[PDB]
Amino acid sequence: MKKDIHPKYEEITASCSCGNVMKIRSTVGHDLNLDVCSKCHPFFTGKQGRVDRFNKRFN
Amino acid sequence: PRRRVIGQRKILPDPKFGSELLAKFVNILMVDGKKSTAESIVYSALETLAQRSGKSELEAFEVALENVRPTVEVKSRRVGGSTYQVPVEVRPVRRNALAMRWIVEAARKRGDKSMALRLANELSDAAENKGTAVKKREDVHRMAEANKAFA
Amino acid sequence: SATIALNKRARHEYFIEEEFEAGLALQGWEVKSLRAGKANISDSYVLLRDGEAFLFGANITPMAVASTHVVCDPTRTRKLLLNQRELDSLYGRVNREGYTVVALSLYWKNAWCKVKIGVAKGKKQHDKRSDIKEREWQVDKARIMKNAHR
Amino acid sequence: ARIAGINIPDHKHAVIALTSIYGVGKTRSKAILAAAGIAEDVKISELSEGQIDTLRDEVAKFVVEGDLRREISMSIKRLMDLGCYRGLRHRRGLPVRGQRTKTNARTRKGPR
Amino acid sequence: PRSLKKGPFIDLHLLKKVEKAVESGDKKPLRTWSRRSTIFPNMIGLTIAVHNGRQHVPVFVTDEMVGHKLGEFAPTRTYRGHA
RNA sequence: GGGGCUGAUUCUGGAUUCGACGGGAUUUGCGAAACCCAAGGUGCAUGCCGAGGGGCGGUUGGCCUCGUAAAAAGCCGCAAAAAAUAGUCGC
RNA sequence: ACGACCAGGGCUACACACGUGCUACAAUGGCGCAUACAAAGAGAAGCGACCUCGCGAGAGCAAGCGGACCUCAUAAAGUGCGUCGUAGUCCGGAUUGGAGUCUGCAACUCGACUCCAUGAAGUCGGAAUCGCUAGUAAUCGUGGAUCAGAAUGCCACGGUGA
Ligand SMILES: [Mg+2]
Ligand SMILES: [Mg+2]
Ligand SMILES: [Mg+2]
Ligand SMILES: [Mg+2]
Ligand SMILES: [Mg+2]
Ligand SMILES: [Mg+2]
Ligand SMILES: [Mg+2]
Ligand SMILES: [Mg+2]
Ligand SMILES: [Mg+2]
Ligand SMILES: [Mg+2]
Ligand SMILES: [Mg+2]
Ligand SMILES: [Mg+2]
Ligand SMILES: [Mg+2]
Ligand SMILES: [Mg+2]
Ligand SMILES: [Mg+2]
Ligand SMILES: [Mg+2]
Ligand SMILES: [Zn+2]
């Protein structure tokens, strides 16, 4: 790389609510607290009449 | 009017000071026919002014209302047909009758958290001939000095 | 090298209430009439039709540069236009009684040809009294200058 | 005070400070925060952090800020299925609550 | 809507033919003029042709329609659009 | 008849009539003509024979219907002149 | 048959304009809950004192007055002090969302009425400017009318009140 015009690029932590934590290289400095990870990506993991309510609510 | 000239009905006073001026002042300080907390606003302004300028109410209120009085004042009569704003005299009834209104036209502009809190300052202003009611008096006396020759 | 046109013989005739500043759509062979100063806005009143306003009757004359031959017509139902939030309510104003809306001036601002718009009232009219208030104001102020000074 | 992260002007009562929080307002929140232990007239002043955070499940047992906008979005999606009177008046550009639209409907129809 | 303790209102002999429709399950489009009732729970997926003033409009019933009425399905507001 | 001048206040240059109109792009939702499979719902069913239709006629050679042979449809012509405010006035 | 009967629909249509008016744009104040205080009428194919389930709209079975007697029904604006305390906001309540009640052969077109959540413009309005001389104008209800059901209307009465 060139020595001058690229910012400071170090590894920061990243924890998510799927159990899969990863620490990788970014630009900020603090823990990028993740929303959703690639396994908990709801592809095969999320998508994996009220007649009875009519009789439920009254008869 | 035309047929029967009428003289006004007499004056019934207000509780704290019995003052026939301030009883007519609670009526211009009355909106929607409610005297009730309107006079609480009156006695709130009377709490603030008669502590931020010394003397007891029944005289010390009168200083700013003396100072915002008019000497000559303008109206329209179409002396031409344009806006030749004709200056004219005033009866001493109408003197105070619009002098108090020049206080309430400033009361409709202040900005505290309560309108009873709002009126702490206008009479202590116009005692020193400052404020906004004296800006109204300065406007009408400016127009009086402007259109003086129209007699 | 032409200046601002006019059709002044309407303003002291109708009633003018609220004013709007239209555009046009010139339709193929007849624009340099306005560029030279040849015009006729005589009895030009916008008949509102189909939500799509037209000028009719106006004899914008053909030029002589463009051969006078395969030119368009002097009179044509020329499709006027104007912004939707300004157009889409005036139907309720104009569609009631013996009202039309007229043209006023084929002027041009912003290097661009225009036409003005204003709602009108009627002609079956004793159209006297505000041509009477002028001589019941001028003579009155002369009389009262005479009275106040003299 | 603090529910579902969406922060607010803090020095209000929580029961109406959660009115940017789409889901709790002037009546329901009077019981919602009373389940935590603070009533509906007291602000955030001298209110401890634990006494704030005892509500993060009590609201979550009901409809929360991120919940209600999506709830009425998916519910108007479901009610936009068929094509009844509420299948053409919700799409032509009219109100649906059954009122005169020959005058004064411009809340739905458009600012004049 | 209506108060919910009622038990909603349909025609008597057309309820009899709803019971004939549960008895049969046949697939005939019948010319039909009823509009003042609800798409019931037990009238799943049989097609008829309902009154709308002058023509006759087909409607297909749905088991997701047990709260509405059967009178919105016939627009008698003569509307082709504005202009 | 040849020759010159004039062809948008840009005249070697770059439209912003913000101006509802015709054509194109983006955001958008559920109907099959914007799209598809037979499991989640379901019975005497599909089609080729053959046959028929709003005081009256027509079209997709065809839209509702019919089983050893005949009764019922959305839109178009004959017709409610379906000009509503009519163009600027008095008769 | 320009006659008469029957099932629904429509008069409430929609980008408009023209009116008649009401709660709004706030701090006299919506906000707290009991509290200082009345008139006027109306009710038996109806009005309804109860108890309780109803803090939500209603009520099941039912007690009384054909009414100076049972009612509609305790006035709100008046007051104790404090909150959103000058914010498009706890203003301000409309487009919506499900959830519930009523009367009614039948509340979708086409009814109010309710739960709870929601919060679009609006910040004293250019010109045509209109009403009013004292209990007047502004401002707060309460009842009758048609009516199974419902009035920001029209009909009256009562407080404050320039
Ligand atoms: Mg809320
Ligand atoms: Mg609430
Ligand atoms: Mg009928
Ligand atoms: Mg009508
Ligand atoms: Mg009237
Ligand atoms: Mg009654
Ligand atoms: Mg109870
Ligand atoms: Mg109170
Ligand atoms: Mg306070
Ligand atoms: Mg509000
Ligand atoms: Mg709610
Ligand atoms: Mg707004
Ligand atoms: Mg404001
Ligand atoms: Mg009089
Ligand atoms: Mg009736
Ligand atoms: Mg009644
Ligand atoms: Zn994921």
From Swiss-Prot, chain A:
This is Large ribosomal subunit protein bL31. Part of the 50S ribosomal subunit. The modification N6-acetyllysine is found at residue 8. Its cofactor is Zn(2+). The lineage of its organism: Bacteria, Pseudomonadati, Pseudomonadota, Gammaproteobacteria, Enterobacterales. Gene3D superfamilies: Ribosomal protein L31. Changing residue 16 to S: No Zn(2+) binding. GO terms for molecular function: rRNA binding; structural constituent of ribosome; zinc ion binding. Keywords: Acetylation, Metal-binding, Ribonucleoprotein, Ribosomal protein, RNA-binding, rRNA-binding, Zinc. The keyword Membrane does not apply. InterPro entries: Ribosomal_bL28/bL31-like_sf (IPR034704), Ribosomal_bL31 (IPR002150), Ribosomal_bL31_A (IPR027491), Ribosomal_bL31_sf (IPR042105). Zn(2+) binds at residue 16. Proteolytically cleaved by protease VII to yield a peptide lacking residues 63-70. It is not clear if this is due to protein degradation or is a bona fide processing event in the strain used in PubMed:339950 and PubMed:10556732. In strains B, D10, MRE-600 and Q13 the only protein seen in PubMed:10556732 was full-length; the last 7 amino acids were sequenced only for strain MRE-600. It comes from Escherichia coli (strain K12).
Swiss-Prot record, chain B:
GO terms for biological process: cytoplasmic translation; negative regulation of translation; ribosomal small subunit assembly; translation. Keywords: Ribonucleoprotein, Ribosomal protein, RNA-binding, rRNA-binding, tRNA-binding. Coiled coil: none annotated. The keyword rRNA-binding applies. GO terms for molecular function: mRNA binding; rRNA binding; structural constituent of ribosome; tRNA binding. The keyword Membrane does not apply. Changing residue 35 to A/E: Defective in ribosome assembly. It comes from the Bacteria. Signal peptide: none annotated. GO terms for cellular component: cytoplasm; cytosol; cytosolic small ribosomal subunit; membrane; ribosome. One of the primary rRNA binding proteins, it binds directly to 16S rRNA where it nucleates assembly of the head domain of the 30S subunit. Is located at the subunit interface close to the decoding center, where it has been shown to contact mRNA. Has been shown to contact tRNA in both the P and E sites; it probably blocks exit of the E site tRNA. The strain K12 sequence is shown. Belongs to the universal ribosomal protein uS7 family. This is Small ribosomal subunit protein uS7. It comes from Escherichia coli (strain K12). The gene is rpsG. The chain holds residues 2 to 152 of 179 of the full protein.
From Swiss-Prot, chain D:
Pfam families: Ribosomal_S13 (PF00416). InterPro entries: Rbsml_uS13_C (IPR027437), Ribosomal_uS13 (IPR001892), Ribosomal_uS13-like_H2TH (IPR010979), Ribosomal_uS13_bac-type (IPR019980), Ribosomal_uS13_CS (IPR018269). Residues 93-112 are annotated as: Disordered. GO terms for cellular component: cytoplasm; cytosol; cytosolic small ribosomal subunit; small ribosomal subunit. Keywords: Ribonucleoprotein, Ribosomal protein, RNA-binding, rRNA-binding, tRNA-binding. GO terms for molecular function: rRNA binding; structural constituent of ribosome; tRNA binding. It comes from the Bacteria. GO terms for biological process: cytoplasmic translation. The keyword DNA-binding does not apply. Part of the 30S ribosomal subunit. Forms a loose heterodimer with protein S19. Cross-links to the P site tRNA and weakly to the A site tRNA. Forms two bridges to the 50S subunit in the 70S ribosome, contacting the 16S rRNA and proteins S19 and L5. Belongs to the universal ribosomal protein uS13 family. NCBIfam families: uS13_bact. This is Small ribosomal subunit protein uS13. It comes from Escherichia coli (strain K12).
Swiss-Prot record, chain E:
Keywords: Ribonucleoprotein, Ribosomal protein, RNA-binding, rRNA-binding, tRNA-binding. Gene3D superfamilies: 30s Ribosomal Protein S19, Chain A (3.30.860.10). InterPro entries: Ribosomal_uS19 (IPR002222), Ribosomal_uS19_bac-type (IPR005732), Ribosomal_uS19_CS (IPR020934), Ribosomal_uS19_SF (IPR023575). GO terms for cellular component: cytoplasm; cytosol; cytosolic small ribosomal subunit. Changing residue 82 to Y: In MW145; suppresses a rimM deletion. The keyword Plastid does not apply. PROSITE patterns: RIBOSOMAL_S19. The keyword tRNA-binding applies. One of its GO terms (molecular function) is structural constituent of ribosome. GO terms for biological process: cytoplasmic translation; ribosomal small subunit assembly. It comes from the Bacteria. SUPFAM superfamilies: Ribosomal protein S19. In the E.coli 70S ribosome in the initiation state it has been modeled to contact the 23S rRNA of the 50S subunit forming part of bridge B1a; this bridge is broken in the model with bound EF-G. The 23S rRNA contact site in bridge B1a is modeled to differ in different ribosomal states, contacting alternately S13 or S19. In the 3.5 angstroms resolved ribosome structures the contacts between L5, S13 and S19 bridge B1b are different, confirming the dynamic nature of this interaction. Bridge B1a is not visible in the crystallized ribosomes due to 23S rRNA disorder. Protein S19 forms a complex with S13 that binds strongly to the 16S ribosomal RNA. Contacts the A site tRNA. Part of the 30S ribosomal subunit. Binds S13 and L5 and cross-links to the A site tRNA. The gene is rpsS.
